[PDB]
Design an enzyme around this catalytic site. Sequence first.
Site, PDB file in Angstrom:
ATOM      1  N   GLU A  11      10.444 -15.530 -10.562  1.00 45.39           N
ATOM      2  CA  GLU A  11      10.279 -15.441  -9.126  1.00 45.39           C
ATOM      3  C   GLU A  11      10.980 -14.306  -8.419  1.00 45.39           C
ATOM      4  OE1 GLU A  11       8.172 -17.108  -7.498  1.00 45.39           O
ATOM      5  OE2 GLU A  11       7.645 -18.900  -8.739  1.00 45.39           O
ATOM      6  N   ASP A  20       4.095 -13.533  -0.657  1.00 49.55           N
ATOM      7  CA  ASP A  20       4.066 -13.744  -2.093  1.00 49.55           C
ATOM      8  C   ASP A  20       2.830 -13.121  -2.758  1.00 49.55           C
ATOM      9  OD1 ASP A  20       2.202 -15.478  -1.411  1.00 49.55           O
ATOM     10  OD2 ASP A  20       3.046 -17.221  -2.397  1.00 49.55           O
ATOM     11  N   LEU A  32       8.032 -21.178  -0.868  1.00 47.59           N
ATOM     12  CA  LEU A  32       6.961 -20.963   0.099  1.00 47.59           C
ATOM     13  C   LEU A  32       7.320 -21.478   1.469  1.00 47.59           C
ATOM     14  CD1 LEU A  32       4.001 -20.188   0.906  1.00 47.59           C
ATOM     15  CD2 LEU A  32       3.367 -22.340   0.144  1.00 47.59           C
ATOM     16  N   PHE A 104       6.428 -25.808 -10.315  1.00 45.47           N
ATOM     17  CA  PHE A 104       7.128 -25.060  -9.269  1.00 45.47           C
ATOM     18  C   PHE A 104       6.209 -24.021  -8.631  1.00 45.47           C
ATOM     19  CE2 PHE A 104      11.216 -23.528  -7.664  1.00 45.47           C
ATOM     20  CZ  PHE A 104      10.881 -22.239  -7.229  1.00 45.47           C
ATOM     21  N   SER A 117      -5.877 -29.155 -20.873  1.00 46.01           N
ATOM     22  CA  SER A 117      -4.703 -28.544 -21.470  1.00 46.01           C
ATOM     23  C   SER A 117      -3.628 -29.589 -21.605  1.00 46.01           C
ATOM     24  CB  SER A 117      -4.092 -27.513 -20.537  1.00 46.01           C
ATOM     25  OG  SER A 117      -5.017 -26.473 -20.383  1.00 46.01           O
ATOM     26  N   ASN A 132      -6.646 -22.781 -24.038  1.00 40.75           N
ATOM     27  CA  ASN A 132      -7.222 -23.459 -22.920  1.00 40.75           C
ATOM     28  C   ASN A 132      -6.503 -23.084 -21.629  1.00 40.75           C
ATOM     29  OD1 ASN A 132      -7.417 -26.197 -21.052  1.00 40.75           O
ATOM     30  ND2 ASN A 132      -9.268 -25.651 -22.204  1.00 40.75           N
TER      31      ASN A 132
END
Length: 162
Positions: A11, A20, A32, A104, A117, A132
């Site tokens: 990040e 972002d 966010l 996250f 998945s 996948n």
Amino acid sequence: MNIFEMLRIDEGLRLKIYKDTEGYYSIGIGHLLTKSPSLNAAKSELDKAIGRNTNGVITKDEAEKLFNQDVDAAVRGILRNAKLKPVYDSLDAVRRAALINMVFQMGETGVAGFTNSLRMLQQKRWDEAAVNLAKSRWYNQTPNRAKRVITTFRTGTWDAYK
Ligand SMILES: [Cl-]
Ligand SMILES: [Cl-]
């Protein structure tokens, strides 16, 4: 390596409001703020979250504090989610951190969606799950980050972060 260090690499850290990867207003370590296209709506959310008139700028401390809250929330959301929990419970510690990283980034709902998945992961079919996972908008938009996370699920090691 651990989840905190892992997300910190994925990040980064910014002390002023920034847009972002999706163009939304964020701050600190991937926190966010708002999806609304309004900087004032951002500033508002920012002050509300920090509990002071920040004027769009926070300290290192403040950022780490939001980060700690955010990691805590991700883990608890996983634990709370009928679809995610069982996957989490089945994994090893390294792979659990990869699932947390996804939640996250995309949210609990966004992740609970990777049905196929998820199933492959619970079954410990590593190489399959990896293939996948790559067929997703997530991988196409943030490929380097997605590769790191996928390698992590693939191997059960932190080599991608080394
Ligand atoms: Cl918050
Ligand atoms: Cl990326």
